[PDB]
Amino acid sequence: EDIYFIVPDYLIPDDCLQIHKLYDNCMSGNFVVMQNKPIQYNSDIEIIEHYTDEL
């Protein structure tokens, strides 16, 4: 469902949402989440601090 926080104003679906990943291939109503990185271990704002002092 649309339990999550919604940033647009009136364009909300107000209807059946779903995640379209594994319910089927290509069938369910669309609301797909996109990760930055599939498995997250360390943020790369730390690696950019890691080399920039050495640099």
Partner 1 sequence: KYLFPKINETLLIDIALGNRFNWLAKEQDFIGQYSEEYVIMDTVPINMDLS
Looking at 45, 51, 53, 55, which residue binds partner 1 (CB under 8 A)? Answer: 45
Binding status of residue 2 toward partner 1 by CB under 8 A: no
> Could you tell me which stretch among 3-11, 19-27, 39-47 binds partner 1 (CB under 8 A)?
39-47
Binding status of residue 53 toward partner 1 by CB under 8 A: no
Q: Which of 1/53 has CB closer to partner 1?
A: 53
Angstrom distances, CA of residue 41 to CA of 1, 34, 38, 48, 52? 28, 17, 10, 15, 20
Q: What angle do CA 29, 21, 34 make, to 5 degrees?
A: 95
